[PDB]
Amino acid sequence: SLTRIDHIGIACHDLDATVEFYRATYGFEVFHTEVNEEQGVREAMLKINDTSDGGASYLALLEPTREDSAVGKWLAKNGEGVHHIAFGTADVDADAADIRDKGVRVLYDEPRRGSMGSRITFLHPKDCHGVLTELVTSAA
Amino acid sequence: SLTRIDHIGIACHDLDATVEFYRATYGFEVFHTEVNEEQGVREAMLKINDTSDGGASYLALLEPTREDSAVGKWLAKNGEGVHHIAFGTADVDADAADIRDKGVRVLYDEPRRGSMGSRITFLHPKDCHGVLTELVTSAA
Ligand SMILES: CC(C(=O)SCCNC(=O)CCNC(=O)[C@H](O)C(C)(C)COP(=O)(O)OP(=O)(O)OC[C@H]1O[C@@H](n2cnc3c(N)ncnc32)[C@H](O)[C@@H]1OP(=O)(O)O)=[N+]([O-])[O-]
Ligand SMILES: CC(C(=O)SCCNC(=O)CCNC(=O)[C@H](O)C(C)(C)COP(=O)(O)OP(=O)(O)OC[C@H]1O[C@@H](n2cnc3c(N)ncnc32)[C@H](O)[C@@H]1OP(=O)(O)O)=[N+]([O-])[O-]
Ligand SMILES: [Co+2]
Ligand SMILES: [Co+2]
Incomplete structure (x- = not known):
């Protein structure tokens, strides 16, 4: 689950x-x-x-x-x-798979590298009422 | 001082x-x-x-x-x-006065009512590299 605002x-x-x-x-x-x-x-x-x-x-x-x-x-x-905007999660892979199953476009098959060793994916803005939306799991 | 992201x-x-x-x-x-x-x-x-x-x-x-x-x-x-985007503070009046003194346009003379009894003001987006920026003190 998405448990914080990670960044803007x-x-x-x-x-x-x-x-x-x-x-x-x-x-x-x-x-x-x-x-x-x-x-x-x-x-x-x-x-x-x-x-x-x-x-x-x-x-x-x-x-x-x-x-x-x-x-x-x-x-x-x-x-x-x-x-x-970006939301943090302990499991970007699981949460991305669950959102994919709701019909929201997930831009990557697998989470990619973001900053400070994080793993990230993105949701299409046209599926999120105009907000480009990132999902982030910290390397720690 | 601004001590959190209050809201998007x-x-x-x-x-x-x-x-x-x-x-x-x-x-x-x-x-x-x-x-x-x-x-x-x-x-x-x-x-x-x-x-x-x-x-x-x-x-x-x-x-x-x-x-x-x-x-x-x-x-x-x-x-x-x-x-x-909105930043939280324990003293919106003080922090707004300090930002006014740096030449960033503060849109209100005094903080106004926001949601849940908060007090709020805004900084002009053209002074903040295109981001409309709110300052918030919670009623509590
Ligand atoms: C490293 C990292 C980062 O966050 S660095 C962030 C930079 N990376 C990214 O943005 C990668 C993901 N973004 C994307 O693929 C693009 O934002 C989108 C999904 C692909 C759009 O791809 P496109 O090839 O279609 O470009 P395009 O401009 O045509 O976008 C197609 C439609 O999406 C809208 N759009 C594009 N970017 C947008 C944005 N940032 N916010 C809202 N809407 C957007 C755009 O307005 C257009 O609709 P409109 O016709 O009604 O105006 N980290 O650590 O977290
Ligand atoms: C209740 C509460 C809330 O937050 S409810 C939020 C709704 N309230 C507000 O937005 C009040 C403060 N906002 C404002 O006064 C307006 O956003 C601004 C400062 C006045 C703009 O006033 P204006 O009369 O000039 O409207 P205008 O569209 O002409 O804005 C003038 C310039 O500012 C830019 N601008 C306007 N709104 C913007 C925004 N939301 N973000 C970025 N730029 C913006 C706009 O693009 C234009 O530049 P451009 O020519 O390069 O495109 N709460 O609890 O926290
Ligand atoms: Co990001
Ligand atoms: Co606000």
């Missing part, structure tokens, strides 16, 4: 400038920074709080590594802003 | 249908339901997790009460999807 994915043109905006305005600091060449993003995770399921909630700031990527395509069309 | 504001055309989608797909149940005639919304809050600052993280599903509202204007232009 926020697309930006300039990761360093957007990271500085969050630090200067809210005092949020960088927890981790990772490039995912498969997904085509450079990511900075800012930890906001721990959660009651033992995990944490982050802002995931995302700059595209290339125009030909989910995030580069999205920024060109929409401008900077919220790109996706 | 998600705009929808039909609150009851979108509430049912979240229940049926993820098992999330309705924590509260409130109409805010000032803001022009009918809201359902779905609690996802408790947080390390003593608060909680919700999905706030929002259907417009009228076309002439922040959310009715937004849905007409953008379709269903994420409308805003």
